[PDB]
């Protein structure tokens, strides 16, 4: 609602704990063979296209 970006940055970064990580953050950090190894079934489940 409000225009002020100062409080936008502050209230998101005021008090934080263990922080979420997205899917493609981990889809871009693995090498080829470790990705294609069948121990990351999550990532191979969600890269169909």
């Amino acid at each position: 609602n409000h225009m002020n970006v100062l409080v936008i940055v502050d209230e998101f970064y005021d008090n934080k704990y263990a922080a979420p990580v997205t899917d493609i953050a981990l889809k871009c950090g693995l090498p080829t063979e470790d990705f294609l190894h069948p121990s990351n079934y999550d990532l191979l489940r969600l890269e169909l296209h």
């Binding site: 609602n1 409000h2 225009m3 002020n4 970006v5 100062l6 936008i8 940055v9 502050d10 998101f12 970064y13 005021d14 934080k16 263990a18 922080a19 979420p20 990580v21 997205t22 493609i24 953050a25 889809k27 871009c28 950090g29």
Partner: protein, 444 residues
């Protein structure tokens, strides 16, 4: 058949400016203050000539790499005598390389057209005018509302914006500086007697149609700078009235006694301005700082953020969801992106500036952790966020999927080499993966 005008040594020069832990913050404030108008920069030509001269002779590096408009200003005029001749060449090679990549993309674009419109819009995201560059000082938004066929909805806070006819009721134009001579007091009284919180109004100067359309600014912000810095830059918010209270409440500014041409550091009273000048190691004359004080009338009140949301082309539009037919983006209004600050610099600089995370190239944990204590304690208490891909930015500002530049772009740019072949690779990744773009690829 592109041949790179630019050279490797100038890219190492830009890289050395990118990792400068002694970057002069006063020049950075001046950069924030002109904000890309021709007349405002002809207000302040001899100051920035002194600035570039002293920073180029004192160490083998140059400032003002950051903002594109200051680059185009320095390339366009002044030059010649005031700055050193070798320091002009870096800027010339940057601007020439930015020109040459455009004809490279145009040759990769087809000569043939679908209908009236050209097909380079479908081939390259850079050539595509639906995309918007991050820093906006000219009124790109109304122009994009005119030229874009597919519905370019603009979000300002709560309020949508989709009609050109709404341009008075949602946008306040900034008048030209000579014309606003009657309305200076009405511009100023809005600060005291108007609330800028939940304003929903955007104060913007006039757009300029001059040349090169939009390709050059896009290739400069999205190709050259993320490569040359390893993408270590963040968005900046500026509190302009505090900057005016620094410069204008100065002792020589009141002074009938103190002359036009003297060293301000001889006769300053102790303050944040003196400390900024000494850490920035540059003695300015009084008339320069009085010009920078005079520029406050026309410059805007505060920084803002804007969501741009454009429907896809007809090649890739097919989706079961209406919300997934449309691709979303951010534009920073009256703010500027940022190299890393020094730790000593953030003691007086914090009263002027604040951090903004932005899209993947311009959202960085180390620079934003430099600007705030909260971001610093966050990144310290959680070091895994130190990489660009993991770092969590607000939903109020940022979303990874609904964008043009995703995470692997930034991951490529972080470990990117300063070679110009990497410039070519960064350019080559911008192909839209469209069916007719595959014809364009099959040609070459």
């Amino acid at each position: 058949s592109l041949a790179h005008v630019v050279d490797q040594a100038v890219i190492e020069t830009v890289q050395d400016t990118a990792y400068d832990t002694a970057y002069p913050a006063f020049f950075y404030v001046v950069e924030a203050m002109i904000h890309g108008f021709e007349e405002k920069f002809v207000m302040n030509v001899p100051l920035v000539s002194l600035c570039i001269n002293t920073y180029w002779e004192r160490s083998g590096r140059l400032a003002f790499v950051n903002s594109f408009s200051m680059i185009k200003f320095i390339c366009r005029h002044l030059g010649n005598n005031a700055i050193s001749k070798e320091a002009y060449s870096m800027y010339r090679k940057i601007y020439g390389e930015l020109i040459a990549l455009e004809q490279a993309l145009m040759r990769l674009a087809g000569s043939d057209v679908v209908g009236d419109e050209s097909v380079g819009q479908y081939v390259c995201a850079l050539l595509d005018p639906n995309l918007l560059p991050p820093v906006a000082y000219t009124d790109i938004f109304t122009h994009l509302l005119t030229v874009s066929d597919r519905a370019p909805q603009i979000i300002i806070g709560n309020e949508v914006y989709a009609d050109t006819l709404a341009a008075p009721q949602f946008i306040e134009r900034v008048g030209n500086m000579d014309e606003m001579a009657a309305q200076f007091v009405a511009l100023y009284g809005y600060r005291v007697n108007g609330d800028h919180d939940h304003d929903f109004r955007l104060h913007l100067g006039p757009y300029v149609d001059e040349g090169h359309a939009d390709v050059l600014e896009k290739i400069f912000y999205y190709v050259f700078l993320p490569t040359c810095t390893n993408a270590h830059m963040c968005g900046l918010g500026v509190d302009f009235q505090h900057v005016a209270q620094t410069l204008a409440y100065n002792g020589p500014a009141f002074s009938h006694h103190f002359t036009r041409d003297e060293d301000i550091l001889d006769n300053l009273e102790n303050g944040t301005l003196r400390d900024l000048l000494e850490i920035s190691d540059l003695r300015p004359t009084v008339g320069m700082i009085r010009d920078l004080s005079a520029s406050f009338m026309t410059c805007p009140t505060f920084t803002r953020a804007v969501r741009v949301s454009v429907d896809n082309d007809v090649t890739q539009q097919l989706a079961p969801n209406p919300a997934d037919k449309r691709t979303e983006q951010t534009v920073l209004v009256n703010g500027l992106v940022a190299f890393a600050f020094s730790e000593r610099t953030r003691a007086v600089t914090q009263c002027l500036f604040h951090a903004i995370p932005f899209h993947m190239f311009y959202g960085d944990p180390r620079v934003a952790a430099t600007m705030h204590q909260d971001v610093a304690t966050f990144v310290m208490r959680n070091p895994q966020q130190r990489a660009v891909e993991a770092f969590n930015r607000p939903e109020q500002l940022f979303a990874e999927y609904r964008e043009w530049h995703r995470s692997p772009m930034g991951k490529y740019a972080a470990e990117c080499l300063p070679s110009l072949v990497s410039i070519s690779g960064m350019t080559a990744m911008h192909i839209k993966m469209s069916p007719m773009a595959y014809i364009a690829q099959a040609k070459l």
